């Protein structure tokens, strides 16, 4: 019943704020570090480290400064947080690829401006 093209979300999931793949990578790293700093905890589950290394493989950035900067720039335009995180994790090579990737983008943003921000985030990629 849920659909991304119309950008329709349930009542609960709409109000939430989406965080990037690098963001969950950083939070998982902090959680793992304080787990190493924990007060004699039990062994962790396979699902946690599985997701952790999956986010590690999906990672494109490692420094928090760039993450803060890209989060600052990406909220300037009316780009929804789900497609924002999708673009941050994906980062294709042209605007048409982004348009064909998420079908909600079609019509909302012109190809020129979308290609501009795509080239900008690709230059900011390290």
Binding span for other proteins by CB under 8 A among 3-11, 64-72, 113-121: 3-11
Q: For other proteins, which is the closer residue by CB, 28 or 95?
A: 28
Tell me how far apart the alpha carbons of residues 110 and 67 are, in angstroms, rounded to a whole number.
25
75 lies in the binding site for other proteins (CB under 8 A): no
Among 11, 36, 43, 47, binds other proteins (CB under 8 A): 47
Distances (CA, A) of 115 to 60, 90, 111: 20, 14, 6
Contact 82, 64 (CB under 8 A): no
User: CA torsion sign, 93 to 95 to 99 to 100?
Assistant: negative
Binding span for other proteins by CB under 8 A among 64-72, 90-98, 105-113, 114-122: 90-98
Q: For other proteins, which is the closer residue by CB, 51 or 115?
A: 51
């Amino acid at each position: 019943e849920e659909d991304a093209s119309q950008l329709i979300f349930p009542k609960e999931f709409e109000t939430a704020e989406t965080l990037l793949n690098s963001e969950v990578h950083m939070l998982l790293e902090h959680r793992k570090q304080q787990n190493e700093s924990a007060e004699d905890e039990q062994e962790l589950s396979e699902v946690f480290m599985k997701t952790l290394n999956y986010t590690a493989r999906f990672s494109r950035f490692k420094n928090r400064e760039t993450i803060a900067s890209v989060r600052s720039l990406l909220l300037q335009k009316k780009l929804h947080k789900f497609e924002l995180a999708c673009l941050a994790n994906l980062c294709p090579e042209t605007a048409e690829e982004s348009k064909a990737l998420i079908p909600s983008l079609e019509g909302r943003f012109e190809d020129e401006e979308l290609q501009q921000i795509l080239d900008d985030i690709q230059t900011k990629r390290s």
